[model samples]
Target: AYTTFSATKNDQLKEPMFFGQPVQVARYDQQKYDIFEKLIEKQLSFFWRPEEVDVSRDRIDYQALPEHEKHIFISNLKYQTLLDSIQGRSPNVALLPLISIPELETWVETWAFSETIHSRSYTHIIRNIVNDPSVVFDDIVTNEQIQKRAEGISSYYDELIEMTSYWHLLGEGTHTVNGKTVTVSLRELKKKLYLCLMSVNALEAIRYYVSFACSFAFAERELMEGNAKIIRLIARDEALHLTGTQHMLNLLRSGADDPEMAEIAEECKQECYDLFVQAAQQEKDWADYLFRDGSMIGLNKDILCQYVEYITNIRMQAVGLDLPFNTRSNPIPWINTWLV
Candidate 1:
C-alpha cells in the first residue's frame, strides 16, 4: 500500500504535510515547516539517559509512603508508562508514512525515539521502587482505568491508520475489497489526520501535564525528587512535542500548505471541540480514580479536575477553538515550581 522510496525528484519545500509524495531523501538542510526542524534541534540538544537519574532514594521513600500515596504514585506512573509506550511506536507507524518532508519525517522519528526513553525512565523508577517490576508493567495492560484512557488516546491514531491503508491501496473511491464495501475519501482522510493531530496535541499538552502535576506533587513534599527530575526532563521534551503539533494544526488551518486542509479544519471545528472536552472529562475521571484511594497534601480530585479545565481552555485557545471552560486560575500554584 506504500513505498519507502519515492523516485521522482520534487520540490520538498512545496509539499504538504500529508497525502503528498512520500519523502524521498533524508536531508535536513531545509523544511516546509521550519518549526519542526527547530523542534528537532531542540529535542536533540536536550536528550538525557534514564540511568543518569538516581532513583535509589526513591525506593526507600516509596517504601515509607502510605498505601494511598503509593496508589497515587504508582497509578500515575503506570499511566505515564502506558502513554509513552504508545507514543514510542505510534508516531512512526502512523505519521511517518504520511509525512512528505525530510525534516518533519526525522522530527517524528526523533520524537518517537525520545518517548522510548520516557518508557525506559518509568521502568528504571519502577525497578528501583518495587520488588517485582513485572507486576507493575503487567498492570498497565490489565488495569481498567488505564485501559479506558488508552482507548481514548489510541482510537484516533488507529482510525487514521486504518483509513490511510485504504487510501494508499484504493486511491480514494468506493470499491469492493474481498466482498466488503469500502469508501476512501481524501477529505475524510484529511479530517482524520486533523483530528488525530488534535488528539496528539491534547495528549502532549494536557494529558502529560496532568500526570506531571501528580508526579511533582510528591516532589513538592520532598518525596520522589528523582522521579520528579526525570519528569521535568520529560516535560521539557513534551513542551517541544506540544509545540510541533500546535504548529501543524495552525499551519493546516492557515491554508499555507493545503487549502483543502484549511476547509477540513473548519469543517471539523465542532468535532475537535468535542474531542478536547472528552479528553478533559476523561482526565477528570482519571483524577477521580487516582484520588479514590485518598488525596495528597497539595493536590486532590477537585484540584486536578479544575486544572484539567484550566489547561483545556488554554490548549483549545491555542488552536483557535472556543473555550469550553470558564476563565479560572491555576488550581495548584505549587506545580509551577516543578513544571518545566
Candidate 2:
C-alpha cells in the first residue's frame, strides 16, 4: 500500500514533516526542516564504534565488586540493553511510514542506526564483564522489572504503529475489518503521532539520562570507567536525538509545519502531561528497584527519585507541557561531566 518512490514530481521543500507526499528523492539541497539535516551532520561528525574502547580491565573490576554493587551495575546495563533494543527498531517501524520530508526521513534512519551501535556497546560491555553473555541477554526479556519498563516505552510505539497501519490501509474512514468496527481519522492519527512524539521525547530525555547517571556513577567512583567512556559517546548522540524530537514537537505545536498538528497538540496537552508524569513515576520506581539491593555511595533511591522529578520538569517544559513536579536542580550534577 506504499510506494518506494513517489512518482508524482513534488517539491520536498514545501511538504510538511508528516502525512504529505512520501519523499521521492533523498535530496539535501533544500529543506523544510533544516535542523534535522543539521542533526544528521552532527551525528555523523560524532561517529564512534563500541570496539574502539578498551574494556579489558572491567572484567577484573566487576569480579572485585561486592554483590550489591554488582546487582546495581548489571541491572542498569540490562535495562539499557532493553531500551536500545527497542529504540533500534521502533523508529523505523513506527515513524518512517508517516514521515514526509527528506531531511526528517533520513534523520530517522540515521538516528536509528546510531541506536544499533549503542545496543552493540552493551554487548561489548556485557561480554567483557560476564563469562556467560547469554544469561544477561536472556534475562532482559524474562525479568519482570525490565519488562515493566519495556511495556511503558513500547505501548505508544505499538499503538501508533497499529493506528498508522489502519490509516494507510483504509485511508481515513470507519470500516469493518474482520467484522470489527475500526475507525481511522486523519486528526485522530495525527493526535497519536503527537502523543507518540511526546513519549519518545520522555524516553530520550528522562529514561536514557537516568540510566546514564547510573553508568557514570560507577565511573565517578573509579569503577567501570571503560563502560562510562562508551556511554559518554552514546550520551552525546542521545542529546541530538532528544533535540530532534524537541524540534518536531515544537514545530508542530507552533503550527509552523502542520496546522492541524498544532490543534492536535493543544487537544492532547493534558494527556501528554500525564504521560510524562507516568514515565517519571516509572523511572522513580526503577530507582527504588535498583537500590533495593543496597544503595551506591553517591546515589540512592531518594536522590534518584528526586533527580527523576527534576529532569521530568525540565524536559516537559522544553516541549511546552505543564511542569508536573516542583522545580528543582539536578541532584547529581557530577553526571554532567559524562553527558555531552
Candidate 3:
C-alpha cells in the first residue's frame, strides 16, 4: 500500500524519479533531478488569479458578435474548459502515488494547481460573456464533439491510475482478482506511465496551442480582449506544464532514470506519434465545428488545420518523435506575441 508519509528514513537523492520507495521526507535542499525543482520555482513566480483580469468589457464585445462569431468564441471557450477540467485533476490522481522524489511531486502539484486557475479563468470569461453559464458548462458533458476528444485523453491516464493502484496493492505478479486472473507488472506499469505523459504532452503542447490561436485570433480584430488577456496568461502557464512533460519524457527515454523506460519509450514511439496526430486531427475537426456556421476574419478551417500541422510537427520534434505531418510554417504568426 502507498503511504502518504512513509515512516522509514531514506536518502531522497538516491531514489529514481518513480516506481521506487515512497518518498518519506519533504526535503528540497538537494534533488536527484533539478529540472523539476526549477519548474516549481518558475510556476510559483507566475501565480495569478482570474478575477485580477477585468473581463467587464467582454460583455459588450460578446453582445455585438455575429451569430457565427458567437459560435466560434463560445465553442472555443467550452473546449478550453473541458481540457482544463481533465488536466486540473488527472495529474495528481494518476502521478503522485508513483513518484519517489520530492521535487517531481511538488512540481506536479504546482502544475495541476495552475490548471485549476486556467479552469477558473474560463468560468470568469464565460460568466462575463454568457447569460447562462449552465448552457455552456453543462453541455461540456453532453456535447458529442467534445466527448470524442475527451475519451482518448483520459484513457491513458485511466490505465495508469488503475495499474498504479494494483502495483500499490499487490507488487508485480499474476494473481486472481475477484473472479479473474490478472497480471500486474512493474515494467508494464512504467510503460503506462511513459505513454500517459506523452498523451499529456500532446494535450498541453499541441491541443492547447491550437485553441490559443483561436483565442488570440479574436483579439487580433479587437474583439474579446478580456478573454484574450486571460487566455494569454493561460498560455504562459501551459508552456511551463508542457516543458515539465517534455523533460519527463526525454529523461525517461534517455534511461537516466530507468533503463527499462528507455526501451519502453522506444517501443511506444509510434503510439506517441499517433497521440499527437490524434490531437491535431481532433483540433482540425474542432476548427470545423467552431466555424461550421461560418469562418471568422483571420481564422478559417484551412488556416487552423495548417496551424495544427505546423504546431504538431514542432511539438513532436521537441520530444524526439518523428514528424507526422508535412512541414509547414506557423499559420498564425501574430499569435506569437501572445505566447512566450
Candidate 4:
C-alpha cells in the first residue's frame, strides 16, 4: 500500500498534502504549496557548515565564566543538543512517507537535514569548549531532565509514526492483531498529523527561541562569539522551519489544504491551546532551572520567563490560537539585534 516511488503517472498537483496517491515524480516545476517550495530554496541558500565558525577563543572565554554562568551555559547547550537530536530525525521519519506533494516532501527532507547541521554544531561547540565532549554528549541521554523533555517532545511523533504504520499496514479498518483490537481511521490519522505538526511548531517556535536567547545571552557578554555566530545561523534556519510549520497549520485550519483538517482544527483548538501553554510553562520552569544557581548579566529567571510569555503570545497568534499571556512587549530587546 506504501511504495517509496509509486509507479503511477498521476498528476502531482492534484494530490492533497497527505493521503493522496503516493508521489511518483519528484518535480519542482510547480507546487501545490508554494510556501514549501520557497522554503526549500531559502534553505539551500542558507546552507552552512558549523565548522566555518571559529570557537578557538570560546575555550578561553569559557575558562573564565563563573560557576553559575558556566552551569547555565553548559545546560543550555545540552538542551539544544537534545532538541536537534529529535528534530533531526522526527519529521522525515514521521512525515516523509505520508507526504504526497513533491514540494512539501522535499522541504521535509531539507528541514530534517538542516536539523542535523544544528546537531553537528552542538558537537562542534561542545568539542571546542569542553575538555571531554563525551561528558556533555553522553549526559544528553543519561541526564534525567533532558530525557524527560525528550520523552515529552517525542511522544507526539512516536504516536503518529506508529499509527501511520498501522494505517499503511491495515489500510484503515478495525482488525485483531496479537488478539488485541486495533483500529486505524484516516480521519484519526489526519488528526494525529495535525497535532504532531502543532507540537513541532511549538518546539521550533518557542522552545528553541528560549535556547537561542541563552546562547545569545553569553555572546551579549562578549563571550562565545563563535557559538553565537553558529546559533545566529541556526536561529535563521529555524525561522524558516518555523514559518513552514505555521503555514501548514494555518493552511490546514483554513480548509485550504483539507476541509476535514479545518474541522479537526476547530475540534482540537483547545488541545492546541493547551499544547502551546504547556510548552510555554515548561520553558518558564526551565528558565528557573537554568538560573537556579544564579542569574547573569543580561538574563535572569524573571526576564527569561517574561520573554517566554512574550514570544508565546506572538507564536500563538500566528497560528490562530488565543493569546495566553499578557506581556505585550519583548522583554529582551537586545536579542532583537541578534536575530536574522
For residues 22-137, write the lDDT of model 1, one tens digit per residue: 88888888777778889998998999999999989999999999889999999999999999999999999999989888888999999999999999999899999998999999
Q: What is candidate 3's lDDT per residue for 171-283, written digit by digit as tens?
A: 88998999998899988888888888888998989888888998899899998998998998889998889989999989999989888899999998888887788888888
Q: For model 2, what is the alpha-carbon lDDT of residue 187?
A: 92
lDDT of 4 at 27: 94
Residue 43 C-alpha lDDT in model 2 = 96
Local distance difference test values of all predictions, in order: 0.90, 0.90, 0.88, 0.90
Model 2 over residues 279-312: C-alpha lDDT tens digits?
Answer: 8888887887788878988988898988889888
Clash list (residue pairs), candidate 2: none
User: Candidate 3 deviates by what RMSD?
Assistant: 1.1
Q: Give all candidate RMSDs, comma-separated.
A: 1.1, 1.0, 1.1, 1.0
Error of 1 at 98 (Å): 0.6
Cα deviation at 103, candidate 3, in Å, is: 0.3
lDDT of 2: 0.90
